[PDB]
Amino acid sequence: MHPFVKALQEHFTAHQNPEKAEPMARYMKNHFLFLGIQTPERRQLLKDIIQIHTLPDQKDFQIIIRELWDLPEREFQAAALDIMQKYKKHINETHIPFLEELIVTKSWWDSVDSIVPTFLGDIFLKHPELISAYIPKWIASDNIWLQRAAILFQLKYKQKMDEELLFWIIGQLHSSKEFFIQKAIGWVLREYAKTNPDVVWEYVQNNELAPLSKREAIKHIKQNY
DNA sequence: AGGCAAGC
DNA sequence: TGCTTTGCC
Ligand SMILES: COc1cc2[nH]c(C(=O)N3C[C@@H](Cn4cnc(N)c5ncnc4-5)c4c3cc(O)c3[nH]c(C(=O)N5CCc6c5c(O)c(OC)c5[nH]c(C(=O)SC)cc65)cc43)cc2cc1O
Numbered sequence: 001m002h003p004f005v006k007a008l009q010e011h012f013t014a015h016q017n018p019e020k021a022e023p024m025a026r027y028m029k030n031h032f033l034f035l036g037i038q039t040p041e042r043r044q045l046l047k048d049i050i051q052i053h054t055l056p057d058q059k060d061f062q063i064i065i066r067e068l069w070d071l072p073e074r075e076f077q078a079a080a081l082d083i084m085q086k087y088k089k090h091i092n093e094t095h096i097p098f099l100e101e102l103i104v105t106k107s108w109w110d111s112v113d114s115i116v117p118t119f120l121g122d123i124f125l126k127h128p129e130l131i132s133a134y135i136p137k138w139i140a141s142d143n144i145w146l147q148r149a150a151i152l153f154q155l156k157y158k159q160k161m162d163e164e165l166l167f168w169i170i171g172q173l174h175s176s177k178e179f180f181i182q183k184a185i186g187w188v189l190r191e192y193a194k195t196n197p198d199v200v201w202e203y204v205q206n207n208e209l210a211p212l213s214k215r216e217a218i219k220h221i222k223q224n225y
Numbered sequence: 226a227g228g229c230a231a232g233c
Numbered sequence: 234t235g236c237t238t239t240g241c242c
């Protein structure tokens with residue numbers, strides 16, 4: 001019902017590509033319909049609408065994202081996250097519950113990974129005293145996407161990584177059977193090893209991990225030991 | 226530009 | 234397992 005969303009829906013729909021829609025949907029295990037609009041085109045179509053309408057007032061940004069989240073085609077959720085990025089300066093700790101909602105609604109790796117290391121990563125850098133109100137809850141929830149959020153919110157931190165916290169989180173989730181948890185553990189360890197390889201190596205040599213997780217973690221540093 | 230990052 | 238095509242940085 002928001003005019004910005006109505007305009008975006010019309011403009012995206014007018015530029016759909018049925019020939020791309022099928023393999024795009026298959027790539028996400030057919031969890032979602034697709035219009036068939038890949039990222040470069042999608043972002044330019046969004047730009048078109050912003051250039052016509054101007055960016056809506058920040059009082060509207062949650063409403064816009066919610067309405068886009070409810071549309072059937074997956075590009076509307078990807079575009080909602082592109083839009084959320086344009087309100088970056090207005091996003092703060094009071095928005096964590098909204099981000100939780102997005103993580104657990106129409107969940108898959110494409111949306112969850114686009115929410116977590118940027119938006120939640122930045123919030124918890126400014127408010128690290130709020131981590132304990134969320135991360136333990138997420139780990140205990142048995143929702144795999146909140147669990148993956150606990151693992152990956154520090155993914156881009158590099159020298160800012162809280163090492164003891166990262167390793168505690170990983171230890172809590174290492175016995176998960178879930179592909180998306182085993183793989184997230186491998187990813188965050190591999191990535192942090194680009195910054196602090198010796199402590200990742202020590203960790204993986206002295207703490208239990210699923211074999212997927214361990215192999216992925218040491219992919220680039222194993223030839224140094 | 227190009228290296229590094231789910232599907233099967 | 235190690236290749237795919239597309240996306241992030
Ligand atoms: C913080 O740091 C990082 C964050 C990151 N996010 C991503 C990311 O979000 N990715 C990377 C890449 C998915 N991806 C691709 N290639 C690889 N080799 C990958 N290895 C892992 N993932 C991979 C990808 C996304 C997200 C998406 O939402 C994606 N969607 C598609 C997609 O839609 N694909 C990929 C395969 C595919 C399509 C597609 O549109 C198609 O429509 C034409 C396709 N057609 C076919 C065929 O007929 S094969 C005969 C394959 C095919 C790829 C894709 C990368 C990335 C990197 C970082 O450092």
Ligand SMILES: [Ca+2]
Nearest residue numbers: 183216231235
């Ligand atoms: Ca792989």
